[PDB]
């Protein structure tokens, strides 16, 4: 039939980047029309692939990863990059073949009081390997002393909220991101 792409974009809700969502698109033909109606100005950045290859996927298997980060960080959802989203949250390989879709969602994902519902991992001992997902909440030990199950001095609950408000700058504003990959 038709690929369920209106459920990737125009999903009722998007996940935190630390818990990025993967949905398989397996055996269908694609229409990306929904992208014009959600995002007036979006971005469709493909590496090593024509985006016309993402039009026929009747005999191909595609991974759609989706999350919300902020605009300064969309540059980290790209091959060979470093930051806190690439290092600790979502890591693309250096040989990446696929596409990265991004668009401003300040109108759905910001609140005058502040939307604290989206989180990113701030602390980790090692960097994430490509396409890895760490959804743990175990306290991080930044010091030489054990943390004993509790945050405090040099002991950090590893996830932090994003503080998204409409008065923020285009940089500091929530962006929805969708990474298309091949299996």
């Amino acid at each position, epitope marked *: 039939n038709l690929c369920p792409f209106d459920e990737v974009f125009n999903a009722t809700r998007f996940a935190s980047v630390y818990a990025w969502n993967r949905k398989r698109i397996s055996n269908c033909v694609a229409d990306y029309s929904v992208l014009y109606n959600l995002a007036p100005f979006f971005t469709f950045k493909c590496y090593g692939v024509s985006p016309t290859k993402l039009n026929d996927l009747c005999f191909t298997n595609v991974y759609a990863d989706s999350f919300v980060i902020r605009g300064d960080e969309v540059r980290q959802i790209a091959p060979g990059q470093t930051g806190n989203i690439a290092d600790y949250n979502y890591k693309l390989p250096d040989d990446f073949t696929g596409c990265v879709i991004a668009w401003n969602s300040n109108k759905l994902d910001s609140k005058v009081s502040g939307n604290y519902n989206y989180l990113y991992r701030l602390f980790r001992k090692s960097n994430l390997k490509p396409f890895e997902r*760490d959804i*743990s909440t175990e306290i991080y030990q930044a010091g030489n002393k054990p943390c004993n199950g509790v945050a405090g001095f040099n002991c950090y609950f590893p996830l932090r909220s994003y503080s998204f408000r409409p008065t923020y700058g285009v940089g500091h504003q929530p962006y929805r991101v969708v990474v298309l990959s091949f299996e």
Partner: single-chain antibody
Amino acid sequence: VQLVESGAEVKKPGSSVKVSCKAPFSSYAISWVRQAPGQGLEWMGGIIPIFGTPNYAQKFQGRVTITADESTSTAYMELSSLRSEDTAVYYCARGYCGGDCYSLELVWYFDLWGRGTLVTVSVLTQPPSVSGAPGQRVTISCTGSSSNIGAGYDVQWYQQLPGTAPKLLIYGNSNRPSGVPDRFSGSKSGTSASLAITGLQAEDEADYYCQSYDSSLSGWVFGGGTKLTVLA
């Protein structure tokens, strides 16, 4: 705040119960778990209110229907075609995800448990029994698989004293909630996890259950339960 459930029921074999559960919750996960008399906790299923499709354990797939009504602020479990086996206590549990719950997979802990709705109808491995020396250290093992503990999911531990609902003891793998003394510790390595109690006290004598997410069955799973007994 405390989850308030409907009253006990005596049902004939073949009937259906609809158990209510109210927060006196759109950001939280509702999870339904039962405990047949003398047995461990069983996960029945769960829903994310408003934005969720209900998720069920394969044991209960065609017999259970988990609903949530936003207006009335109540969550419902309807178990149909009852047998004698379904006699148990039915608990509802609220799960925190820090803010809003995308899915039932991302629940950090089920901190607020209900009452018990007792319905009478006319896997992770744990030591069934552990004996401990007072003032000394005991450990309770939780051993899982590469579909759960070893898939990168965290272990929670729960305490059940006689007559009450489980109480959250450690979430994370090792994190103590507020109120839980330092004597309790948690640890996770590979496909196994461990609760430790130091300076054992007669009050620590209770049942302990571990819990994790399993991605191959796409739900929560409980351990068999451990009856810790404090010696003299």
